[PDB]
């Protein structure tokens with residue numbers, strides 16, 4: 017019993033965190049094989065950030081301008097290239113702690129663990145979801161740029177996020193490991209705002225199933241709904257549309273608890289229109305949307321790595 | 322910006338998780354140097370759970386009765402001893418991944434990260450607080466026994482908890498790494514119930530300071546309170562008494578935000594009276610009590 021916002025064990029990722037310095041800027045890098053990946057804005061000055069030409073800024077740099085530190089060992093940079101918004105620093109030493117890994121781009125609603133780092137040193141691990149507006153509600157301070165988001169599938173670390181910036185609302189923006197930003201964001205010091213956020217409906221339903229598995233049933237009702245009537249309700253309360261794909265993904269949880277997905281949707285519909293009425297679900301007075309259906313199955317079944 | 326329930330990076334602890342088997346029972350062990358620590362109930366049978374005589378059950382065991390597996394490598398048990406409710410299995414190999422570590426016993430209200438494990442394999446990491454009733458609200462299934470709670474402060478891993486059991490309410494009970502249980506619990510299947518749980522007041526105040534640091538001030542008021550009047554009100558909402566020690570501990574946050582502890586106490590009194598009225602504090606519709614004053618300063 018119990019249900020916590022649980023992150024993947026971060027060990028395989030901690031072995032990859034290095035410190036990258038370029039002039040006065042110091043941030044984090046991900047050392048995989050003989051390449052260190054970090055945000056390309058590491059080559060910028062505060063003036064350069066206002067309107068940067070990264071090809072022009074990078075062409076002026078030499079390998080010795082990038083100081084890479086893996087623990088208390090300096091790694092020598094033997095090459096440097098840019099792929100979208102990520103700088104790739106070729107180093108002389110392959111990371112002996114390189115795990116089995118992939119670079120994956122995730123979709124909004126998908127969750128991942130963030131290993132927050134400062135000066136190439138991991139300081140904390142938390143779980144979060146890629147919001148439908150492509151931001152993440154992280155916890156990041158100055159120097160966290162280069163911190164990575166990941167999932168662990170069996171023995172393979174799927175790197176899905178690299179932290180680049182904080183938006184004025186306190187939410188965070190970053191790229192996949194190929195340097196492609198999530199969302200309509202650019203790595204420039206300018207006016208950028210995240211779009212209006214929505215609730216990840218499939219994730220709320222997954223979390224309602226987790227509450228049922230944990231003995232919290234007060235919100236269940238005798239009712240069911242059509243997928244179209246539920247989506248008309250979801251659209252009204254800034255909830256993401258629930259697709260037939262989502263209904264299929266919730267199938268195992270529906271079979272385990274004996275509550276059909278559209279029956280759980282009628283519970284969610286009632287919760288949206290009436291509220292919790294002084295009650296809580298899994299110790300929460302809000303509907304939690306940062307647990308995917310896979311996270312719920314994984315946690316309520318003990319999958320190890 | 323942002324405020325998350327953040328756990329410590331678990332790598333230093335993952336390198337210590339091993340699987341311990343005794344007969345039919347399989348649980349987790351913590352391999353530090355040449356010793357594997359695990360709950361002593363690993364030696365118990367089916368009818369030896371209500372009133373186990375651990376000294377009697379352990380005297381009947383030999384080293385070869387304990388199978389210890391570190392990854393895909395079997396470790397050879399060369400000794401076994403019991404220290405309170407923890408079994409210490411001396412092995413023939415020192416763990417090369419042993420970090421700098423300490424065994425620390427924590428007080429209620431303290432937080433720690435839990436590395437949940439099954440069959441010596443880490444499956445997830447989450448942040449917990451030791452409840453005032455000495456239980457933890459963890460997320461654990463069968464086979465999680467032996468999973469550990471820890472903090473990492475300046476490269477050193479302070480192990481503070483080893484999971485032993487789940488109480489009938491779904492909350493968890495365990496020991497420090499010296500085998501001393503937290504709370505009035507025993508490692509027997511006898512009827513055991515946690516005392517009524519209360520809110521960790523100092524932690525709620527720390528979290529209100531975190532919200533102020535993050536730009537949220539809607540809940541602040543023009544009132545102050547005496548510590549005694551605060552405690553008389555807070556006690557009625559099942560909040561822990563706030564001691565002068567707690568007021569002192571909140572001093573740095575009070576100085577950083579410019580809000581005196583007793584002024585913040587008056588906001589808390591008002592929040593308990595009014596609720597949130599549709600508002601949230603740091604994305605939460607409830608008052609969060611699993612962030613200590615130290616966690617707030619560290620994260621902000």
Ligand SMILES: O=C(Cc1ccc(Cl)cn1)Nc1cncc2ccccc12
Nearest residue numbers: 156157158160180181182203204205322
């Ligand atoms: O935002 C930047 C630096 C930066 C990078 C790119 C651009 Cl376009 C503009 N600024 N770093 C930070 C990242 N995350 C949280 C942060 C909290 C506080 C301060 C700095 C934080």
Ligand SMILES: O=C(Cc1ccc(Cl)cn1)Nc1cncc2ccccc12
Nearest residue numbers: 017362461462463485486487508509510
């Ligand atoms: O509580 C026990 C078994 C046990 C150990 C020691 C003593 Cl004295 C009595 N019973 N194990 C478990 C631990 N944590 C979560 C659990 C969820 C579900 C099932 C079993 C769980």
